[PDB]
Amino acid sequence: RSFVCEVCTRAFARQEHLKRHYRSHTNEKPYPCGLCNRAFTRRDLLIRHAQKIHSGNLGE
Numbered sequence: 008r009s010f011v012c013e014v015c016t017r018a019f020a021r022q023e024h025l026k027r028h029y030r031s032h033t034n035e036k037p038y039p040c041g042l043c044n045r046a047f048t049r050r051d052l053l054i055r056h057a058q059k060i061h062s063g064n065l066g067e
């Protein structure tokens with residue numbers, strides 16, 4: 008069929024192309040804020056981000 012990335016469901020036509028593109032889909036910021044569309048490296052950071060700007064109440 009086609010080489011589609013298993014992270015953003017994109018499309019390709021080569022294995023080496025999607026290969027190097029997959030390397031940037033695992034060591035990326037695993038804490039994407041779902042309020043401002045940002046990214047963090049630590050989990051404690053994402054909490055201090057919303058609780059200080061968005062909000063808290065268990066969530067965000």
Ligand SMILES: [Zn+2]
Pocket residue numbers: 012013014015016017028032
């Ligand atoms: Zn991708």
Ligand SMILES: [Zn+2]
Pocket residue numbers: 040041042043044045056057061
């Ligand atoms: Zn945010």
